Subunit: 347 residues, 2 copies
């Protein structure tokens, strides 16, 4: 599989099954091993799929480390996100057919492998006319972005939204989806030499303002809201003082939604802000959303996002294609504090 192909057809002739498996929780670099697996049987309502591409995401890493809200039984296959082609279907399957592309209906499936047999209900069909890189990353980051923009505060064109980790996959999707919604984004990024290039890139995605964490926390920020309404929504993935400074920007009655961060960097909320500004703090967990909603509700979200991708309104972040056998370097790269390219395992 060549991740960047414009020829979205692939051969699926028989080959050995290989998977990235971990038998203990721990450092992904140490616990994840490439293994051969036996050919599994396709029961009545099962389908056999051939994995095309699967990103390495923070949640994949946290799961392997054992610091996540869902922990598949061990030994487990790594990876929660990816796109696969249906290659065979059980005798009772009528809703998927060979050649269909599918992504997992929820977390926990184990996507870092060449092929697998899954229950039909564990999968969602996705359109096969979108770039592979987009299909591979469709089910997590832009879904999280869309849900947080829709589910917490009622926003209309010209309203503002503030976020941190703006250059992350979710942050870049927030920028693009907010732009399509007519929202005005204030996008906080970590301080970095050569901030200009990053700012230009995020503005090319539709970002209205791009400011560093240092700019966020300095007195001049108090004057930021001439020509710009205060946001009623703040999206956080950083915690600590950064999360407190995001809170400080919210309009009275606003909500800050936390969708990621580190253990030992909790979110910090001043008493004055909670009480006198009546701010709200919430979390968002996409996997719980998927559990709580129908497969059809997830599919509807997917289709909405695909409409955006076809129009060039939702483009994937920079990616590096890595053959499954070269996973070790990809895992190492994915655990750095500054990742320049999303690592995407191909087979």
């Amino acid at each position: 599989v060549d991740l960047g192909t414009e020829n979205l057809y692939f051969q699926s002739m028989p080959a050995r099954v290989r998977a990235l498996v971990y038998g203990h929780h721990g450092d992904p670099a140490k616990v994840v091993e490439l293994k051969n697996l036996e050919l599994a049987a396709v029961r009545g309502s099962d389908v056999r799929v051939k994995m095309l591409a699967a990103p390495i995401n923070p949640s994949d890493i946290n799961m392997i480390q054992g610091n996540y809200g869902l922990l598949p039984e061990l030994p487990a296959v790594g990876g929660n996100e990816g796109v696969a082609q249906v290659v065979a279907v059980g005798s009772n399957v009528t809703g998927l057919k060979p050649g269909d592309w599918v992504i997992p209906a929820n977390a926990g499936l184990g996507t870092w492998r060449t092929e697998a047999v899954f229950s039909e209900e564990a999968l969602i069909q996705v359109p096969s006319d979108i770039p592979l890189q987009s299909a591979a990353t469709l089910g997590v980051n832009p879904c999280t972005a869309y849900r947080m923009l829709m589910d917490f505060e009622q926003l209309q064109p010209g309203d503002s939204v503030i976020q941190n980790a703006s250059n992350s996959g979710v942050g870049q999707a927030v920028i693009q989806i907010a732009a399509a919604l007519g929202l005005r984004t204030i996008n906080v990024v970590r301080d970095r030499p050569d901030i200009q290039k990053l700012s230009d890139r995020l503005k090319s995605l539709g970002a209205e303002h791009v400011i560093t964490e240092e700019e966020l926390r300095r007195p001049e920020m108090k004057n930021f809201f001439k020509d710009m309404p205060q946001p009623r929504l703040a999206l956080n993935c950083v915690g600590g003082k950064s999360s407190t400074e995001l809170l400080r920007q919210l309009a009275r009655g606003g909500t800050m939604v936390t969708y990621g961060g580190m253990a030992k960097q909790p979110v910090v909320a001043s008493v004055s802000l909670l009480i006198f500004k009546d701010l709200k703090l919430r979390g968002f967990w996409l996997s719980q959303w998927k559990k709580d909603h129908s497969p059809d509700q997830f599919k509807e979200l997917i289709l909405t996002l695909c409409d955006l991708i076809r129009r060039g309104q939702l483009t994937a972040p920079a990616c590096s294609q890595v053959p499954l056998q070269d996973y070790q370097s990809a895992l190492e790269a994915s655990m750095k504090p500054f990742i320049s390219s999303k690592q995407i395992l191909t087979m």
Copy 2:
């Protein structure tokens, strides 16, 4: 005025007007002075009241210090809570009459004085058949307790609620009101030599469990919820690690409401708790509630609480009566970390 009288009638013959006034924000002990004021005129819709008793509350102190969400213009009279008797009414007043008891309709009025002229709309009539100590403290602490129990989570008999600062005025009211609602309270208190006496007293108010902050944070707390459902509501006034440990006790989807605390002790929320447990953090500001609702809505709350007081189901905490002239000692006593008696200024 003798605060503990069972004879709830008082003389209101003319006397000089004396008030506790501050001209700068700062240490209440330093900025608050006893002053004589001129006799004010009663306009058409004004009423003249004689103050009977007024507590000293944390919010009064924070206002004087300048660290509060509402700051009356200076020079200002101290105090936001109290009960007064109407002594005279303007020609257009028909809803209050001489002899009625009233409390402020909202914060900011300046209650630490012997008498005042206020707009009729700035006051709420309260029943005059309840003890003076109860009338003096009715408008803030039990109102805050009731509102937080009613406004955030739908609770039914047998559901649990957890709180800290359980021996405070609000905490004691939460215990009593929760008891009357058929709720099961878990009441966290600060560690103190001779904890037994405090625990007995809070249980005499209807508290189900009384545990110290140390007991809250120790591993054994993980086993606390056999025979007891996890609370969907937590009430916080402490912040810091204490607030994090309260959060840890909430059922998935629960809410922690913060209604007080210190500057420099912010509320701290772990990412895991926000995301995987879908917890909510909120604030509650009674003065904002009063601003947002009608005087009639506040009066309805008052009447509900008075029904409880008459039945012995809402008793006032221990109080010390302090003549207005002796305010300095009362202010000093009210600013200690462990206050044994609520200080109530009388005139």
